């Protein structure tokens, strides 16, 4: 059985970047340090976080005076941010530096009172933290998941809308819903694009090229974590089995009996040792050595802030 | 008298980046690697990498077969990288992404003949390797370089237009530019504000802070440096005498004489080492400790290609 492995793959700068905030502030500070919601959505980092003293907490209110708090990499609200400046806490924003740009063009529209679109899914916190940016009555911050939301949506002052979108989102799904939000309002502003990071486009496309060769799809990652999520369904809908798993533990045999090439990616939270022991899963499985696609170089970095260098 | 230093100042991640690189292909293949422009607009960073042996040239006719090149941090046209590509030489891209990315939506416009138009400053290489990512007769490619030229522009189909901006511009100046843009085209589609870069946002953003306090500035930067020109000429325009420098020898006393605040501050191509001595001479003219400002902390960095690290 042929090994083959995504590339790009794994971890992104954001979640780097955020990990090692957690990780550093525990090695120079000590524990407990508070992050509030799971740093990255995997569930390996936040049980190995926890084991070294980290605390997950679901409310500011929830930590302690004279504490240190973590923002999670998706980021969080304005009323987040304010409340926990408000409170006697030394606080580390490991937001993303993407997720945060998405953020100020919502709070200048705020600004302006001129109503705003974000394409998303409801409930995840890149969704809570990038609405939450928007406070103007006069004006309005809407979401929309689909055609069909932006078909059923109606507005103040079309003639002063702009939109945005969540970070890691299906790229072509995506482009669905651009398409239609421009024919039901012409006069729409945006970005080139779209708000889709180079992390989850890569992704998106080194599987595409990955369910090409391979049956059977093995993608990284945690239940919660959105672009890994999205690196599964790809798979799928080019016709190969594909299954979303947290480690090496969670393969079936019945997955890859018989099968000739499987392939195997990670999502943006999922670290590397993952993959290795997935690798390494089958082969006692019968595979043989991995082959690492070739793909377009990443050469991104989020450095952590000064204070927080080891 | 009272010195203060701008921040952020200084080396930026598209520098850092293609410095490395030439440094990189020095130290793995040796003397002498081809270098097509300044890597970066810095006279004390480029005497240097001519040390090392790095030579560099602006037409690729200069550089002889089996050749190592290195394509500059400003960028190249697709002219000059399919010349690059039809000959034996090996190549190396130090362009940096944040320019990179414009190209690739210059090219899109290209492929689709339609019409784009570049807020630049003409003669720049950057503005000559945007420019060149356009080759479709059908469309067409046009620079601005003020609102005036917006003015009396004229292009085909104005239904399907886009801009696209250098990456070291005026932030207020482009703006003039795009307002201008808009009322003549209002079909005009480009990104939510420009292509200027995160570090010429912010350098000219800590120069505004610094001239506030400082009746003189001085940048350090070369004079083909743009992004540095624009430091100086941002304090000029708020009253304060600005010069751009190379070096702290280019500091003449009547400059700092009777002044009670000095500022000092970098363009994106200038080693941190330069302001040093620039601090130090300004020391010995009666300057104290060098304070450093309260400024937006960067944390990006580009590395460099896995072949050359
Ligand atoms: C922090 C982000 C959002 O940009 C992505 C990194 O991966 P996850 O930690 O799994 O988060 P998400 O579920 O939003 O993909
Ligand atoms: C490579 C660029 C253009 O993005 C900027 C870095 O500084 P310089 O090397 O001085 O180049 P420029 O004159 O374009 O500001
Ligand atoms: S997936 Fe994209 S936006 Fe989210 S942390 Fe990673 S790099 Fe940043
Ligand atoms: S000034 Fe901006 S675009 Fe030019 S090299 Fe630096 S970071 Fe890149």
């Not at 979640?15 to 407990?32: H, Q, T």
């Not at 009172?113 to 406070?135: D, F, K, N, R």
């Not at 990652?221 to 190969?240: C, I, T, V, Y």
Request: aromatic share 6%; with cysteine; net charge negative.
């Amino acid at each position: 059985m042929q090994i083959l492995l995504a590339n790009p793959r794994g971890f992104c700068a954001g979640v780097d970047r955020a990990i090692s905030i957690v990780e550093n502030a525990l090695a120079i500070y000590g524990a407990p340090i508070y992050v509030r919601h799971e740093v990255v959505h995997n569930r390996y980092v936040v049980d190995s976080l926890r084991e070294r003293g980290a605390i997950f907490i679901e409310q500011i209110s929830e930590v302690p005076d004279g504490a240190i708090l973590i923002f999670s990499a998706h980021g969080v609200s304005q009323a987040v941010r304010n409340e926990a400046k408000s409170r006697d806490l030394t606080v580390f924003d490991a937001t993303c530096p993407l997720v945060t740009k998405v953020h100020m063009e919502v709070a200048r529209a705020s600004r302006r009172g001129e109503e705003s679109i974000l394409i998303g899914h409801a409930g995840h916190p890149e969704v809570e933290g990038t609405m939450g940016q928007y406070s103007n009555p006069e004006g309005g911050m809407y979401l929309v998941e689909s055609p069909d939301d932006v078909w059923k949506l109606t507005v103040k002052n079309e003639e002063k809308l702009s939109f945005m979108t969540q970070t890691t989102l299906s790229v072509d799904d995506t482009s669905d819903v651009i398409d239609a939000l421009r024919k039901r309002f012409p006069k729409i502003v945006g970005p080139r694009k779209d708000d889709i990071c180079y992390a989850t486009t890569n992704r998106q496309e080194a599987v595409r090229a990955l369910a090409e060769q391979a049956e059977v799809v093995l993608v990284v990652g945690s239940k919660n974590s959105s672009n890994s999520n999205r690196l599964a369904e790809l798979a799928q809908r080019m016709g190969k089995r594909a299954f979303l798993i947290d480690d090496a533990k969670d393969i079936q045999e019945e997955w890859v009996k018989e099968v000739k090439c499987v392939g195997v990616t990670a999502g943006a939270s999922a670290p590397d040792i993952l993959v290795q022991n997935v690798v390494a899963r089958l082969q006692q499985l019968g595979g043989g050595e991995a082959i690492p696609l070739e793909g377009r170089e990443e050469n991104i970095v989020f450095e952590v802030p000064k204070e927080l260098r080891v």
